[PDB]
Symmetry: C3
Subunit: 319 residues, 3 copies
């Protein structure tokens, strides 16, 4: 099958990057919804690399305020190795999360095979706090800081992260859907001159102009691999309520679909993260199903499913 | 009253174009909501042609997998006759559906008086399956195929449809709202080069550009009569949930009103279909009322009701 | 603090501009939600001028069909005095409503100190009926008529309003959010040539172009003070349901924030009204909380809170 429809699925049932239990069930609920079957139904070559085994680290003391550092660092180290393996096999890595701390391992692993990659980060949050600027101490709100080359010398020696080498420059990342950014994060975003489309820019320009500007900024100079790190809380809680850090006034279901349809069309999607789906956090059974169905729809759009329709290269009027 | 506010109401209580009971009650619920009274309140000349009886056809076996062919064909044949009568009386035909298979009759009969008409098709679906590409066998998913000149030779001899002569060319129809298209339908849409604005184009351009492009595409060469075939499932199920085939990520209430406000302003609306309102498909009594109210609001906008306001040509400061 | 973050808060617990009880509780629910504390948390210099006492006028007979005229006129007269005082102290007046009839007093008071002010009116409605074009007789739908210079000779001698001097020209007001306008109001809007962006223009242009056009229409010739009169029913009832006159197909939560973020950025916000919050009109306790939280978010955006983020002028990395 086509490169843009050749996929390597990695389950990452990890929750210790944040304090809310349940996000480790994200891979289970996405698989039960029939993600793999639905992808095969749209002419995808799907290989399931299974769920990564995350061994318990019982004596995981905090680094200052930073919680579960060895567990988070090890999970990302393991994921980096697995993503690099998937990438070497000529497949688009599809990481089923799990909390967003896992992006450390997902992007690190992807950069080992494709160092020229560009990142599209769909989230309500920047996730760029350092272990020193964080007030929460949750590593799911810090993955971008460990990855950026410009933040080298600002990341202290955190236990479990000695394997980390910053793999992306501030110019190689574009944020979409921002609406809840810490002061420390806003300082970083502005001082490093990172490209971003907060909800203010989405409202001003429309998602059409947002995507036109995002893809031109990342691909204008030359075609390069795209890594889409999708936090379901990027979309409004009316679509993805079963998530840990929901923020009102989010991207619509349509905008989420549009972003992913435009990324598919480039033929350059090389890595994908579907993060922060927490089935324990739906106020009703319907809120869980709604979140899972939305996450599945986003994923299908990444691999070719289009709202105008799709057809096989045959003559439907003369079978 | 003005030509654009002179109306002939036709109730078409018909459901056999699809399997879900209740759509035949659409004319009853739209009338009970006060549609006729509300139209007269906004300076409309309204004539009620009543509800078509549609006598039972007990012996109506399927054409291959195509269900109730004689019932669907005869209902459309009689509707074509009724619409032609309304059009001859110098009135805009307002068809209260009923399932969308009735568009065969509505457009066919409208073309008998105005063969130069253009079609705006608001729907989540293309409804362009032929009796041979259809997988469901439901004729409400095939009306466009029976109407298109370019599909002549691809429509088999279906019982109840010998009266049908394709009346519109692929170039005289514009779709708005698409989001659930069958492979066969997508093949047709692309091969015939039909103009369409799926939810992807609406997201990219905005409804303003969509309407500017739709009206210029249909009216640019010369002014001609407009036929708007409105399937309530074109709007998001958060506005029109009481419908047979709902699809998430639909046109908003605002977008639905914008489309219809722009069509009214041309002064060229000549035929209108308000289809697929099913008052047995409300999960609560409020979902039915919500669907009916939305359908009524769309209809009022077609006949001049504007969000900015309306006033009579009198001095309001000196009565 | 910066001029754009230096505020004078005025509570206006008044409901007699309309028939639905509960809108007088708007200042109480907005204060309980922590509005003052949240503003101080985003580096605002906040001075609380308290809640205005509105004394009962027992024999307040109607002027034709126009209800509670002396009560509405007196409440606006008091508010005008208070807003002018806040403006003289070099602060942005922040009026917590209360029904929209209070805009007579808030804009009148503001024009006394800044006669060159420009009005942005966010609402589903025009509120431009005169005491003679009104059909409901509710004064919360007539404040713009009392304020416009072009409507002088058109407004009759209404008891409680002899203090009113029209302070704004038809060219100095921009409407955003219009979707339920009376025939008489539409006639006024068209005959006076007032600038407006009904929901039809918002749908056509997008909120980005709406704001670009609104700010250029008002500020193009030169910088001048901005008065934003925000009616919570300007936003869709899915965001602000606890309100007296809700109309479907309204401005989104995002559009409301975008309008207010753009106004903040000019540094010219000089007067603000947060009106028509009615906590007695929520179908559930959550509907009230949702309306109050939305109104608080709009207010915070007016004084600098930005969705991209905010930071203090310090080195966060050192
Ligand atoms: N900046 C945050 C942090 O925890 O660092 C966000 C982290 C969000 C992480 B996520 O979902 O994007 O991966 C959540 C916010 N709430 C108070 C702390 C704030
Ligand atoms: N294209 C369809 C068909 O029945 O052929 C749709 C028909 C749409 C009918 B309507 O509402 O636009 O009139 C319903 C879908 N479900 C599976 C088959 C699909
Ligand atoms: N124009 C109105 C009026 O009462 O004059 C509106 C007044 C709304 C005032 B408000 O909420 O914008 O401040 C309410 C409408 N319903 C029938 C009469 C109409
Ligand atoms: Mn997030
Ligand atoms: Mn995140
Ligand atoms: Mn249809
Ligand atoms: Mn449909
Ligand atoms: Mn108002
Ligand atoms: Mn209003």
């Amino acid at each position: 099958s086509a490169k843009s429809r050749t996929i390597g699925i990695i389950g990452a049932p990890f929750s210790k990057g944040q304090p809310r239990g349940g996000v480790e069930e994200g891979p289970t609920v996405l698989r039960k919804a029939g993600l793999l079957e639905k992808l095969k139904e749209q002419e995808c070559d799907v290989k399931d690399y299974g769920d990564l085994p995350f061994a318990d680290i019982p004596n995981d003391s905090p680094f200052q305020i930073v919680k579960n550092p060895r567990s988070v660092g090890k999970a990302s180290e393991q994921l980096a190795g697995k993503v690099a393996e998937v990438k070497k096999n000529g497949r688009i890595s599809l990481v089923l999360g799990g909390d967003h701390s896992l992006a450390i391992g997902s992007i690190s692993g992807h950069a080992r095979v494709h160092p020229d990659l560009g990142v599209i980060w769909v989230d309500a949050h920047t996730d760029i706090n350092t272990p020193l600027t964080t007030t929460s101490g949750n590593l799911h709100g810090q993955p971008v800081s460990f990855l950026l080359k410009e933040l080298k010398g600002k990341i202290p020696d955190v236990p479990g992260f000695s394997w980390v080498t910053p793999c992306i420059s501030a110019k190689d990342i574009v944020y979409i859907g921002l609406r809840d950014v810490d002061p420390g994060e806003h300082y970083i975003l502005k001082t490093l001159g990172i490209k971003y489309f907060s909800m203010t820019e989405v409202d001003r320009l429309g998602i059409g102009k947002v995507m036109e500007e995002t893809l031109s900024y990342l691909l204008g100079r030359k075609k390069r691999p795209i890594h889409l790190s999708f936090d379901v809380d990027g979309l409004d809680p009316s679509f993805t309520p079963a998530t840990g850090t929901p923020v009102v006034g989010g991207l619509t279901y349509r905008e989420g679909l549009y972003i992913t349809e435009e990324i598919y069309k480039t033929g350059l999607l090389s890595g994908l993260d579907i993060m922060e789906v927490n089935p324990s956090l739906g106020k009703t059974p319907e809120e869980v199903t709604r979140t899972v169905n939305t996450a599945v729809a986003i994923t299908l759009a990444c691999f070719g499913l289009a709202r105008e329709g799709n057809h096989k290269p045959i003559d439907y009027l003369n079978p």
